[PDB]
Amino acid sequence: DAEFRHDSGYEVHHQKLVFFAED
């Protein structure tokens, strides 16, 4: 997620989805 842009791209998903990689 890049509304909640931890990384602004598409991988390290901190926030909302909690899919695998984070912060």
At residue 4, the 3 state secondary structure works out as: coil
Q: Is 22 in the site for Cu ion (CB under 5 A)?
A: no
Interface map 2-21 toward Cu ion (x if CB under 5 A):
-----------x--------
Are the CB atoms for 23 and 6 separated by under 8 Å? yes
Residue nearest to Cu ion (CB): 1
Closer by beta carbon to Cu ion, 13 or else 18: 13
Those residues with Cβ within 8 angstroms of residue 17's Cβ, 6 or more apart along the chain or in another chain: 1
Residues that bind Cu ion (CB under 5 A): 1, 13
